[PDB]
Amino acid sequence: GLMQFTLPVRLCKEIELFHFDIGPFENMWPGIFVYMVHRSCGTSCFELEKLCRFIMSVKKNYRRVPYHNWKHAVTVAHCMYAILQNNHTLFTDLERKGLLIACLCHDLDHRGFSNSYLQKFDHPLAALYSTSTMEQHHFSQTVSILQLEGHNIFSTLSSSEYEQVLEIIRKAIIATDLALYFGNRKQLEEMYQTGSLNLNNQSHRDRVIGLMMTACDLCSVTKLWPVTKLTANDIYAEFWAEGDEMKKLGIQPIPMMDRDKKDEVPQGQLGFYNAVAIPCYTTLTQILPPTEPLLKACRDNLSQWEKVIRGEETA
Ligand SMILES: CC[C@H]1C(C)=NN=C(c2ccc(OC)c(OC)c2)c2cc(OC)c(OC)cc21
Numbered sequence: 001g002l003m004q005f006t007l008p009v010r011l012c013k014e015i016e017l018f019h020f021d022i023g024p025f026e027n028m029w030p031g032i033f034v035y036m037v038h039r040s041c042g043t044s045c046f047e048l049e050k051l052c053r054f055i056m057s058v059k060k061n062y063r064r065v066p067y068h069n070w071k072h073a074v075t076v077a078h079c080m081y082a083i084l085q086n087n088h089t090l091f092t093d094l095e096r097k098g099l100l101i102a103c104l105c106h107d108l109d110h111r112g113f114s115n116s117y118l119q120k121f122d123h124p125l126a127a128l129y130s131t132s133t134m135e136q137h138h139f140s141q142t143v144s145i146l147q148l149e150g151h152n153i154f155s156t157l158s159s160s161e162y163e164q165v166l167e168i169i170r171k172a173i174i175a176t177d178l179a180l181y182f183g184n185r186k187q188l189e190e191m192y193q194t195g196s197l198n199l200n201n202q203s204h205r206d207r208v209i210g211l212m213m214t215a216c217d218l219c220s221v222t223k224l225w226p227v228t229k230l231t232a233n234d235i236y237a238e239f240w241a242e243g244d245e246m247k248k249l250g251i252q253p254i255p256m257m258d259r260d261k262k263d264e265v266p267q268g269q270l271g272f273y274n275a276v277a278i279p280c281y282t283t284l285t286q287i288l289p290p291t292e293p294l295l296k297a298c299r300d301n302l303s304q305w306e307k308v309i310r311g312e313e314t315a
């Protein structure tokens with residue numbers, strides 16, 4: 001109860017900034033997450049003992065893949081923390097609790113392969129879940145871990161508060177399916193521009209939480225250039241492994257995933273910043289003005305990728 005987590009001074013100050021990098025010391029990431037829960041939520045949200053047992057079971061159920069790993073989980077949670085702390089009064093107690101947990105869990109038991117690859121491989125999960133295949137799995141894994149003995153971090157909630165938070169978490173994890181992002185953001189753009197956006201409308205809240213989840217999930221593009229550039233290496237290491245698996249099924253992969261087309265990466269990143277990242281952080285900045293540093297950092301990295309293309313710097 002009287003047991004604060006504290007961080008060294010540099011981390012204590014930088015963890016509040018959107019562009020914070022959680023660092024290479026894996027053993028500090030649980031501490032960093034608890035620190036964020038405590039400041040975002042309160043020291044009373046969760047029994048420390050239950051929280052710690054939940055964090056470590058979640059960690060254990062992330063795999064040793066190049067990108068979709070435990071470090072991505074904590075990184076995506078830190079971006080949500082940054083959004084929540086810069087928008088203090090907009091979110092309920094339940095939303096603050098559920099969203100940091102949703103981000104920590106959003107890619108549970110990821111294998112480093114897209115929904116598309118599971119569908120073409122004919123993976124059992126593709127028979128169980130026809131759309132948002134991995135995301136329905138991530139939510140399945142979350143509920144599993146919540147139900148292990150000593151792991152119910154929500155035990156103090158009422159029967160119906162408990163249902164509301166698992167419903168926040170489910171929608172938040174499903175929204176990390178980038179195929180759903182495009183329509184979600186179009187709708188939010190129209191609602192905001194015609195003045196119909198209403199944060200008291202639960203179905204509007206839901207859409208706005210989806211957009212945050214996309215923003216937090218993509219936050220690699222919102223770091224300082226050396227972090228952004230080195231992360232893009234992990235990201236493409238998975239894409240090219242999936243590409244190789246596509247070729248093993250006798251399917252030319254899309255160029256993104258083809259390691260024979262490394263030269264096209266800088267132009268691929270341009271498309272991604274223009275078609276996905278900039279639009280995402282633009283609409284997010286329109287709905288939540290204090291998230292503008294995410295849009296500013298994204299724009300800076302687009303400019304760094306333009307420089308890579310003009311040979312004014314090598315990756
Ligand atoms: C969460 C988004 C993230 C990811 C881990 N996976 N999927 C795509 C993607 C996007 C759009 C797509 O539509 C073209 C797509 O095709 C299935 C795939 C992706 C592509 C990137 O660069 C190309 C990228 O660079 C930072 C980051 C991502």
Ligand SMILES: [Mg+2]
Pocket residue numbers: 106107134176
């Ligand atoms: Mg995912």
Ligand SMILES: [Zn+2]
Pocket residue numbers: 072076106107176217
């Ligand atoms: Zn993710």
